[model samples]
Target: MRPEVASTFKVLRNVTVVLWSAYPVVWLIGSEGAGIVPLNIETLLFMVLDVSAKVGFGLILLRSRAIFG
Candidate 1:
């Protein structure tokens, strides 16, 4: 990785990790133990996380200089 692009990679990686981590937390919240989040809302949350982690982050990766080289 280029030196200038390293920070971007770090931020992207950390954000992706955190975003993916939210999935399990969301699941736990929707479980019978918690039962705070409803099924429909949980599904929507999953969709939102999916799009942001994959589509949104993908666009950032494609737009970054790290991929150009």
Candidate 2:
């Protein structure tokens, strides 16, 4: 692994544990499924989680390249 990306990759991987793992959880417990949370709220939460996991993480990693440059 490249020295700079290796350490940051671990952070990226660790973050996936909570963010990616919650997909089924939020769905199954949502109003659209078997639980109490309404679809309105569930959908909004999913939006935030998706943005954070994708765009937000990507921005961080993009800046992280500064460490090696």
Candidate 3:
């Protein structure tokens, strides 16, 4: 990889990590503000799915970087 391309990927990895980390913090704030605590099964299921999606996407981005690096 060109130096610039490698640097770009490094930036991408950092951004990916930051964004993914921020999402859960935001989710927590929103959940509290909206009284989403004491979650029932259905709500819990959706929250689980939502978290899973975020994690999966983050993993995909990390894997892509690894594959190309």
On TM-score, the leading prediction is 3
Rank the models by TM-score, top first: 3, 1, 2
Model 3 C-alpha lDDT per residue in residues 1-69, reported as the tens digit of each score: 567978998989999999999998888787875656555656889999999999999999999999998
- Give per-model CA RMSD: 19.1, 19.0, 19.0
Misplaced by over 4 Å in model 2 are: 1-37
1 or 2, greater by lDDT: 1
Candidate 3's TM-score: 0.43
In model 1, the Cα lDDT at residue 47 comes to: 93
lDDT of 1 by residue, 1-69 (tens): 566688888989999999899988887766855664576788898998887789877778778967688
Judged by whole-model lDDT over C-alpha atoms, candidate 1 comes out at 0.80
Score residue 24 of candidate 2 by CA lDDT. Answer: 77
Highest lDDT against the true fold, candidate: 3
Every candidate's lDDT = 0.80, 0.79, 0.86
Return the clash pairs for model 1, or none.
none
For all predicted structures, in order, the TM-scores are 0.36, 0.34, 0.43
lDDT of 2 by residue, 1-69 (tens): 565778888888899998889987787666454564566687899899998789878888889998869
- Deviation (Å) of 13 in candidate 1: 0.3
